[PDB]
Design a binder for these strands. Sequence first.
RNA 1: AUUAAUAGGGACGGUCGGGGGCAUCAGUAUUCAAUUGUCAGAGGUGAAAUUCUUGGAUUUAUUGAAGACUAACUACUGCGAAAGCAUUUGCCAAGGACGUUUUCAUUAAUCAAGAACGAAAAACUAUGCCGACUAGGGAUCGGGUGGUGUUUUUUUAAUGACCCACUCGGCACCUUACGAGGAGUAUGGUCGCAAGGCUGAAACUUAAAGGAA
Lengths: 157, 240, 193, 150
Amino acid sequence: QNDLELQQFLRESHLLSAFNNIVYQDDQVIGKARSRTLEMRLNRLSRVNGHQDKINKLEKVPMHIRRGMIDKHVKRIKKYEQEAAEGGIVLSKVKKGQFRKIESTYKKDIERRIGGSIKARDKEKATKRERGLKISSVGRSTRNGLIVSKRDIARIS
Amino acid sequence: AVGKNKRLSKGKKGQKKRVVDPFTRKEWFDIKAPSTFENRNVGKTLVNKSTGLKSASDALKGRVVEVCLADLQGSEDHSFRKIKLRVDEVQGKNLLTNFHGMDFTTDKLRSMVRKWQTLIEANVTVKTSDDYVLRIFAIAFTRKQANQVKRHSYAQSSHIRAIRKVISEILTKEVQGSTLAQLTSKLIPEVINKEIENATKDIFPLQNIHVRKVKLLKQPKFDVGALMALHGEEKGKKVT
Amino acid sequence: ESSFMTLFPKYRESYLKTIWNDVTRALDKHNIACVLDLVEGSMTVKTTRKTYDPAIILKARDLIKLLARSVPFPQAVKILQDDMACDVIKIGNFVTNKERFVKRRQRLVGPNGNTLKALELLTKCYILVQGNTVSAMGPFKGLKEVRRVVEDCMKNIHPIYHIKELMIKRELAKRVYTPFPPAQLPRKVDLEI
Amino acid sequence: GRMHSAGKGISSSAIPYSRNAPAWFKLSSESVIEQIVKYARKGLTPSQIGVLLRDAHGVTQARVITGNKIMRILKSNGLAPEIPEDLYYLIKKAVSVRKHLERNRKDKDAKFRLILIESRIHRLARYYRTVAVLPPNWKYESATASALVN
RNA sequence: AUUAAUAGGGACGGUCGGGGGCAUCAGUAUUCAAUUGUCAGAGGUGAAAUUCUUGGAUUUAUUGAAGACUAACUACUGCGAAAGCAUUUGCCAAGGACGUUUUCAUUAAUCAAGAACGAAAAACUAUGCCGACUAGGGAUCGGGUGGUGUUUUUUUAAUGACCCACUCGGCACCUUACGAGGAGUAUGGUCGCAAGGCUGAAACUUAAAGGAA
């Protein structure tokens, strides 16, 4: 993990396959593999210390276009998951907000116009739900009811 | 160690002058199969000395040959089965074999194994009337009806244990009621597994039913009259 | 003459019924006839009277093996080529603790699939982890490497060690018991009794 | 409740609403009563008395047909047990398992099941002793119950 | 001389399971050996070496023993208190669920302490708001009830499979309703470090040998 280059090659394992269908080394790499993987490294290094909106702003796509893209994409993700789940193949796991990343998204570069996941649903889920206005401030509410301590019965007797 | 870089080992120190010409000294014997089969003629086999008539006879008594039931039985589908024939008599450029065992073939077993259904395996040890001791292995996979909608058809283990006991009963009553030619003629056209299917259709309908393997374990004292009878002694010609 | 048959499940039945025409035109380029049974759920390859590659009957057998193991059709015909063999690796019998076993399998696939994909690139193979069998395809030396790394992953060596090792190798190649239990402590009530 | 285990089952016999006789029953209370004491002289536990009388002779419940429950009919006839039937069956279970262990010294699961059964035996005996249907010095012990069965 | 809790026991009934115990039976491989062939190499690897081989290894054939394990079937699963459990046929007990117009009548729920059971080179990118909580939805395993036709068979033995409607109870998944420091730089301080006269060769301009040229 403290190594700097094995783990980099693990991270851009997918782009290299995608755009060279070896030359993992960053001084024989050529073409759109070189371009995209540089965009990768710069985003990671800046992500640890920049602010969330400016480190990943999305390009502008009108509404029906972007909704259409995400819909078609999610059907492709679920086809993949169904085919593996049937003919039982393990799949790497994803934090259940995020879109699973597959070889079609690495090729189409659809992450720049879709995003990691639907940010509105992310934020709205990660809020905590709002409690009521609270009233009876003398005892503890249990499954059985208000337990009212002897000391408090004394203090307001 | 062929090449020029390859160093000597203890290896090529004392060699042997190959002079003997083994495939001059050898001799060819024709073999032949019992009378329960169609294409009786098969095979020629070598004997490592000719100059032992009795020594040659000892080698050919020892032998075990095995052959595809297709070419043994006319039907040119290589019917995925093997007959081991054992040679236990000699007479004059003819070996008079006898039945020794049987097996399916691993590609046929892969050809039947399937995922959403269980297999049933019975393996009964029996005795024929000729005092041979047999071990017969029989296999059967459960099936879905001509009607179902559930996606998989598994047998509850009551049904499995009643099927295994039923298969055991049919096998042991049929082979104890056989003699060894009577067995072989039963085994050739696959009539046992119709008996199994017809007697197990009342439990949980099986599809794919077979007599997988037969292992011989015991033979009696050898029986020349019986064997030459099963196949079905001679003047010389007066060298002067 | 010779023929080999295998069986597939119904999801592959729909997929196969699409791709089948490319199979018969590829195998007839090699002169091998084939047939698909939706009635029983099988696939059969036969040689014909005009074929003459006795190895191709074994390779095409293995083609239908892969397609019913749900490897898609482009990777099937890569089995049909000459310097490629498939391989099934068993991983059922390496540990008992099932939690531990599932963790080790997922260690082989790894975050986003990275370790599997990086072995795929460094060994030119095509790996498919299923259940208890890791089915790979590739050139034979690739299969040597895969068997070593998957086996020691199911034993306790991290595949990331074997990936580092492969990368460097390639660079240099360029250069008392009782059964009766004790008594029971009595309750306060029964003590009062 | 459901201790010792993992199931939350509800599978009981539900008693019909009305506490009157069925409209088709035609026998007589003393006939049922003499039948019960006949079965007791045969030597059957009240559970079995009821299930015979439901199956064969067509009685719903003793308290429905006759005026009283079974074992008070028994006590009216001097047919009481020593120790009540659920305790008795429990003790039989525990000592039988104990014999099995003594045979098969390497049964961890049977050791565990013995511990659970005796736990029930202690609880039940405590309640029975509490209401005083058993003598207050009634002690379930290994050889005591073993010779009770022997 | 109460009711019989969608509280608890307990009995009975037909089952269900890769739960446990002792015993048995089988499977190919592997290791060892006997016997048989044929002839010079085998094994292993980035490449090799150690190693085994003309008292014949590897290889082929017939058999024998030996210890382990229980393939493919093997999951959208099953059983177990947890650790865990996988070929057969017995035997010994135990168990959940379901069925029940049986039986007892609050016998109870959670638990600090305490007791039973608990292989142990390991671990290494996972992560889900929860809650005493409302409706559901698809498949799944176990039992039960009705309907219904196909598979089935008919006086001697099993009268089991599938489809559908419900219905209890399970391991699950998909939806819903309400609710309580981090990163970096600077540093006339303290401690620790730290340099080079071509070497030999220093009291000696000091030979032979090198290192550079």
